[PDB]
């Protein structure tokens, strides 16, 4: 969905992550879908918090001191520190790589499931131009436009007007 | 003539993230999981101030080296600080038996 | 006269975040030391104007 069929994003849409751009006789403009944006934030905040909060660290002093005749256990201490370093650098790095993929995939799902709710309500009354848009074969006023947005659209009363167009 | 479009947010954010399949992906919003900043100060740990020794080390402090006279130990400390100039230790040559072990046990009192 | 939960030879760190790259030798309830220069986690979406 993101860079898939919908080519780009809107700098004009200011107040949300996902939304709609309409155009009729009454006017035009960007409108952010608040409900889906709010959920997206609520789920990703949970993701960010889960990676952060699940790290419960013990009180530890990493520093140790060994004399000139204690080099073996000094190197054992270094092996313990370098061992934890490698484990943590590797796991932290991959976790970031894997979670960023999932986050960008999550955003793709939300944009797709929003297109496939508008398409799912309209059918014959509007043609899919592609690029995320629906060119209405009829007069769709601000109430008609808002009826699609909240998911309470009435299909049959425009189909006859759409049939002739 | 009438149209409705489905889209997503864009801004002038230049923040790049790395995914498993793709490097340098520019995103609208992000968080840094890595802490790369410090205040550059030796602070009180657990609310308790550290024991700073300055020109003296633990050997010089605990034995009472003449150069460690102007030094006052508190009732408690969370950790001990020595400097790169902590050269004042045993002014009369010899071995401090189990020096490191004493240092470890004195670290927090 | 500052207060801290994690102390480092070059200065105290106060977080929050699970990972740090300041110094391996730390005293206290400290974030785990890593060799990473960045660990940026995407929250928003792919930015394409």
């Amino acid at each position, epitope marked *: 969905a993101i860079a898939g069929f919908i080519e780009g994003g809107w700098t*004009g849409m*200011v107040d949300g992550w996902y939304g709609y751009h309409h155009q009729n006789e009454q*006017g035009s403009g960007y409108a952010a879908d*608040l409900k889906s944006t709010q959920n997206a934030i609520d789920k990703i905040t949970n993701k960010v918090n889960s990676v952060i909060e699940k790290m419960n660290t013990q009180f530890t002093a990493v520093g140790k001191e060994f004399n000139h005749l204690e080099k073996r256990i000094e190197n054992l201490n270094k092996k313990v520190d370098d061992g934890f370093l490698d484990i943590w650098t590797y796991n932290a790095e991959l976790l970031v790589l894997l979670e960023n993929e999932r986050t960008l995939d999550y955003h793709d799902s939300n944009v797709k499931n929003l297109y496939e709710k508008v398409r799912n309500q309209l059918k014959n009354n509007a043609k899919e131009i592609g690029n995320g848009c629906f060119e209405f074969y009829h007069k769709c006023d601000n109430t008609c436009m808002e009826s699609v947005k909240n998911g309470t659209y009435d299909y049959p009363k425009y189909s006859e007007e759409a049939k002739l167009n | 003539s009438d149209t409705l479009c489905i889209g997503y947010h864009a801004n002038n954010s230049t923040d790049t993230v790395d995914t498993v399949l793709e490097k340098n992906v520019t995103v609208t919003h992000s*968080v840094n999981l890595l802490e790369d900043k410090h205040n550059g100060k030796l602070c009180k740990l657990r609310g308790v101030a550290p024991l700073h020794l300055g020109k003296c080390n633990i050997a010089g402090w605990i034995l009472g080296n003449p150069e460690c006279e102007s030094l006052s130990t508190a009732s408690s400390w969370s950790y001990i600080v020595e400097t790169s100039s902590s050269d004042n230790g045993t002014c009369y040559p010899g071995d401090f038996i189990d020096y490191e072990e004493l240092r470890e046990q004195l670290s927090s009192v | 006269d500052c207060n801290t939960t994690c102390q480092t030879p070059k200065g105290a760190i106060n977080t929050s975040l699970p990972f740090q790259n300041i110094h391996p030798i730390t005293i206290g309830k400290c974030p785990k030391y890593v060799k990473s220069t960045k660990l940026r986690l995407a*929250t928003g979406l792919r930015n394409v104007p």
Partner: antibody
Amino acid sequence: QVQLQESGPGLVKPSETLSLTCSVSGASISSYYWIWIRQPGKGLEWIGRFYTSGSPNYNPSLRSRVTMSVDTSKNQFSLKLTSVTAADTAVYYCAREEHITFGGVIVRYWGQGTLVTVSP
Amino acid sequence: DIQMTQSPATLSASVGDRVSITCRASQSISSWLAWYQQKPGKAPKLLIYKASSLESGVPSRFSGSGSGSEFTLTISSLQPDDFAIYYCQQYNSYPWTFGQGTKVEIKR
């Protein structure tokens, strides 16, 4: 950091139309949602939001009397409250609505507020 | 819309005291709650957005907690400059509604 400055009559007679103007310097008036907030005595009340492109939203308890506009040339943001009474005697604030973030949409930059009295 | 019920109405505490201001929503507002500080004859200053997240440049003594209905602003160690009226604001849905307010005066 952005400046917002409220300007108005200060005194307006009952049943008349109140006209206020938010002069913005530091950022473009066309790039942001802008909000009006008034406090009477009483606590804070949110009047509504307006954007150049587009579709404004106003408080249901005020919708019939409120109108907002944006002047792109003078970089200004306007409020028009019609048929005013003593209840409309308040300090009126113009504030910027920041773009969506992880927060996401919150008022950070405010004007310094303008007092408006409704009296003959 | 959503009614924001704030407690207490007035508050008087000394320097160093812990101050707690409680806000309640009439319905579940997730974490879409903001805290403002209003100094006399001035515009409200944002302290906490998203129920707990601290605004840049605001002292760490200010903290937020809560989700759903019950929310809490906490000043851990009160300061002479903390004299102001404090407001909670929901931004879950329109219209945005503020709490009635909590006036905090400094005891000396």
